[PDB]
Design a protein around this ligand. Structure first.
Ligand SMILES: *[C@@H]1O[C@H](CO)[C@@H](O)[C@H](O)[C@H]1NC(C)=O
Ligand SMILES: [Cu+2]
Length: 235
């Protein structure tokens, strides 16, 4: 159970984005239904009044929280991977539009899941803004908590992989469009019951064996990291 507070650009806090430049849902409940329109940008997908200006090569940092800013972030039980996607705003995230800019699942050296390192990072994870066409974009940040992912929601609706999905409205101003955006996957649609990484038993299967859901990260990406860029407590 987690939500996005706002973003940072190049290490500079852009301010509370909830219902402003983040298409925020009303609470931190997960999405579980892989076929639901809620997979696109969570349960209150509508245009919000602001879009954060960035340029290609900027660092865009999402900042998550549980109940209040810079708290425990997400329950430690919610082991799983983190991904970020991009699509043009004109799509409203419909169709074959979502391109992956970032993936982190399990780090064998540190023996930590992406979620574990998100907590250590005070909720902060980043991508580098790609050289796509200037214009309006949706950046879709996705945490998958696997603690009840031994079951499929479609079979048992009180269990399943949990998706914490947040869409940020981002305007890319300066870009040479040297890496124009390639075809995307649909959400809902890309994840199915047979997709690698959707049904997994983190209690019995070694984390080293985990494979995150495709698609692969676009070669045009520059992303990106799970790491604290800014100290929220100084404000
Ligand atoms: C899952 O989403 C689909 C598409 O909106 C819907 O038809 C189905 O009823 C949903 N399942 C549940 C259990 O609500
Ligand atoms: Cu939760």
């Amino acid at each position: 159970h987690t939500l996005v507070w706002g973003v940072w650009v190049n290490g500079v806090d852009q301010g509370d984005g909830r219902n402003i430049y983040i298409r925020s849902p009303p609470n931190n409940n997960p999405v579980k239904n892989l076929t639901s329109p809620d997979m696109t940008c969570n349960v209150d997908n509508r245009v919000v009044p602001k879009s954060v200006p960035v340029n290609a090569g900027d660092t865009l940092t999402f900042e998550w929280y549980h109940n209040t800013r810079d708290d425990d972030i997400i329950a430690s039980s919610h082991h799983g991977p983190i991904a970020v996607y991009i699509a043009p705003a004109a799509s409203n995230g419909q169709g074959n539009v979502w391109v992956k800019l970032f993936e982190d699942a399990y780090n064998v050296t540190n023996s930590t899941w992406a979620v574990d390192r998100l907590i250590t990072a005070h909720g902060q994870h980043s991508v580098v803004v790609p050289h796509v066409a200037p214009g309006d974009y949706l950046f879709r940040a996705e945490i998958i908590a696997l603690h009840e992912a031994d079951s499929l929601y479609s079979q048992n609706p009180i269990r399943g992989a949990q998706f914490y999905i947040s869409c940020a409205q981002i305007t890319i101003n300066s870009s040479d469009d040297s890496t124009p955006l390639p075809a995307g996957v649909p959400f809902p649609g890309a994840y199915t019951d047979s997709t690698p990484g959707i049904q997994f038993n983190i209690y019995t299967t070694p984390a080293t064996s985990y494979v995150a859901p495709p698609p692969s990260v676009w070669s045009g990406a520059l992303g990106g990291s799970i790491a604290q860029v800014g100290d929220a407590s100084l404000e």
